[PDB]
Amino acid sequence: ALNLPYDEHADAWTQVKKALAAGKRTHKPTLLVFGANWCTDCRALDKSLRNQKNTALIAKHFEVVKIDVGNFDRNLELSQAYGDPIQDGIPAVVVVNSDGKVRYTTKGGELANARKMSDQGIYDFFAKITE
Protein backbone atom coordinates (compact mmCIF):
# COMPACT_ATOMS: atom_id res chain seq x y z
CA ALA A 1 0.00 0.00 0.00
CA LEU A 2 1.26 3.42 -1.10
CA ASN A 3 1.40 6.56 1.10
CA LEU A 4 0.50 5.10 4.54
CA PRO A 5 -0.43 7.64 7.22
CA TYR A 6 1.88 6.17 9.87
CA ASP A 7 5.60 5.65 9.47
CA GLU A 8 6.33 2.30 11.01
CA HIS A 9 10.09 3.01 10.86
CA ALA A 10 10.09 6.42 12.52
CA ASP A 11 11.98 7.16 15.73
CA ALA A 12 8.85 8.51 17.38
CA TRP A 13 10.61 9.90 20.50
CA THR A 14 12.96 11.95 18.31
CA GLN A 15 10.02 13.14 16.21
CA VAL A 16 8.05 14.18 19.28
CA LYS A 17 11.11 15.96 20.73
CA LYS A 18 11.58 17.83 17.44
CA ALA A 19 7.87 18.81 17.25
CA LEU A 20 7.83 20.00 20.87
CA ALA A 21 10.95 22.09 20.17
CA ALA A 22 9.13 23.62 17.17
CA GLY A 23 6.07 24.34 19.32
CA LYS A 24 8.18 26.08 21.94
CA ARG A 25 9.91 28.13 19.20
CA THR A 26 6.64 29.10 17.44
CA HIS A 27 4.55 29.32 20.66
CA LYS A 28 2.15 26.69 19.35
CA PRO A 29 0.73 23.55 20.93
CA THR A 30 1.80 20.17 19.54
CA LEU A 31 -0.72 17.56 18.43
CA LEU A 32 0.33 13.96 18.95
CA VAL A 33 -1.80 11.55 16.90
CA PHE A 34 -1.56 7.91 17.99
CA GLY A 35 -2.79 5.30 15.53
CA ALA A 36 -1.77 2.63 13.05
CA ASN A 37 -2.14 1.85 9.35
CA TRP A 38 -4.39 -1.18 9.89
CA CYS A 39 -7.02 0.92 11.62
CA THR A 40 -9.73 2.16 9.32
CA ASP A 41 -10.68 4.94 11.78
CA CYS A 42 -7.09 6.15 11.80
CA ARG A 43 -6.99 6.14 8.01
CA ALA A 44 -10.27 8.08 7.89
CA LEU A 45 -9.06 10.67 10.37
CA ASP A 46 -5.88 11.20 8.33
CA LYS A 47 -7.84 11.55 5.08
CA SER A 48 -10.09 14.20 6.63
CA LEU A 49 -7.21 16.12 8.17
CA ARG A 50 -5.65 16.18 4.69
CA ASN A 51 -8.51 18.17 3.16
CA GLN A 52 -8.01 21.86 2.42
CA LYS A 53 -10.19 23.31 5.23
CA ASN A 54 -8.85 20.98 7.86
CA THR A 55 -5.17 21.23 6.73
CA ALA A 56 -5.38 24.99 7.10
CA LEU A 57 -6.85 24.76 10.61
CA ILE A 58 -4.23 22.24 11.79
CA ALA A 59 -1.24 23.94 10.12
CA LYS A 60 -2.13 27.34 11.56
CA HIS A 61 -2.56 26.12 15.13
CA PHE A 62 -0.40 23.05 15.79
CA GLU A 63 2.85 21.30 15.29
CA VAL A 64 1.87 17.69 14.49
CA VAL A 65 3.45 14.24 15.00
CA LYS A 66 1.92 10.88 14.05
CA ILE A 67 2.94 8.03 16.35
CA ASP A 68 2.56 4.44 15.10
CA VAL A 69 1.35 2.06 17.80
CA GLY A 70 1.35 -1.01 15.54
CA ASN A 71 -0.93 -3.80 16.75
CA PHE A 72 -0.97 -2.12 20.14
CA ASP A 73 2.68 -3.22 20.32
CA ARG A 74 4.84 -0.27 19.24
CA ASN A 75 5.70 2.99 21.02
CA LEU A 76 3.62 1.98 24.00
CA GLU A 77 5.88 3.77 26.44
CA LEU A 78 5.38 6.99 24.52
CA SER A 79 1.62 6.57 24.94
CA GLN A 80 2.17 5.89 28.65
CA ALA A 81 4.35 9.02 29.01
CA TYR A 82 1.60 11.27 27.65
CA GLY A 83 -1.31 9.95 29.64
CA ASP A 84 -2.30 6.62 28.01
CA PRO A 85 -4.33 8.18 25.19
CA ILE A 86 -4.68 4.84 23.33
CA GLN A 87 -6.14 2.81 26.17
CA ASP A 88 -9.44 4.24 25.31
CA GLY A 89 -9.11 3.36 21.52
CA ILE A 90 -7.34 4.65 18.39
CA PRO A 91 -6.98 7.08 16.80
CA ALA A 92 -6.23 9.08 19.93
CA VAL A 93 -4.73 12.51 20.41
CA VAL A 94 -2.69 14.43 22.97
CA VAL A 95 -2.40 18.23 22.84
CA VAL A 96 0.82 19.40 24.50
CA ASN A 97 1.18 23.13 25.23
CA SER A 98 4.11 25.16 24.03
CA ASP A 99 5.79 24.62 27.42
CA GLY A 100 5.93 20.85 26.97
CA LYS A 101 3.10 20.00 29.36
CA VAL A 102 0.03 18.04 28.32
CA ARG A 103 -3.21 20.08 28.02
CA TYR A 104 -5.69 17.52 26.76
CA THR A 105 -5.85 13.85 25.93
CA THR A 106 -8.73 11.82 24.39
CA LYS A 107 -9.62 9.48 27.24
CA GLY A 108 -13.12 8.36 26.08
CA GLY A 109 -12.46 7.17 22.60
CA GLU A 110 -13.59 10.57 21.25
CA LEU A 111 -12.05 9.79 17.82
CA ALA A 112 -12.30 6.00 17.92
CA ASN A 113 -15.18 6.06 15.39
CA ALA A 114 -13.57 8.65 13.09
CA ARG A 115 -14.56 6.60 9.98
CA LYS A 116 -18.19 7.54 10.77
CA MET A 117 -17.45 11.23 11.46
CA SER A 118 -18.10 13.91 8.90
CA ASP A 119 -15.42 16.36 7.78
CA GLN A 120 -17.33 19.04 9.69
CA GLY A 121 -17.39 16.86 12.90
CA ILE A 122 -13.63 16.42 12.60
CA TYR A 123 -13.14 20.13 11.93
CA ASP A 124 -15.30 21.03 14.95
CA PHE A 125 -13.35 18.66 17.23
CA PHE A 126 -10.00 20.30 16.42
CA ALA A 127 -11.45 23.82 16.21
CA LYS A 128 -12.74 23.52 19.81
CA ILE A 129 -9.16 22.92 20.96
CA THR A 130 -8.06 26.12 19.14
CA GLU A 131 -10.74 28.24 20.92
What is the domain-level CATH number for residue 49?
3.40.30.10
* Full DSSP string of 43-93: HHHHHHHTSHHHHHHHHHH-EEEEEE-TTTTSSHHHHHHTT-GGGG-SSEE
Helix, strand or coil for residue 34?
A: strand
How many domains in the chain? 1
Give me the torsion for CA of 116, 70, 105, 79, rounded to 10°. Answer: 170
Ramachandran angles phi, psi of 39, nearest 5°: -90, 115
Domain housing 97? 1-131
Q: Please name every residue paired with 95 in a beta bridge, in sequence order, or none if there are none.
A: 31, 104
How big is the chain, counted in residues?
131
Element spanning 123, H or E:
helix 119-130
Instruction: With beta carbons less than 8 A apart as the criterion, state whether 37 and 5 touch.
Output: yes
Give the experimental resolution in Å.
1.3
Contacts of 61 (CB under 8 A, 6+ apart): 28, 29, 126, 129, 130
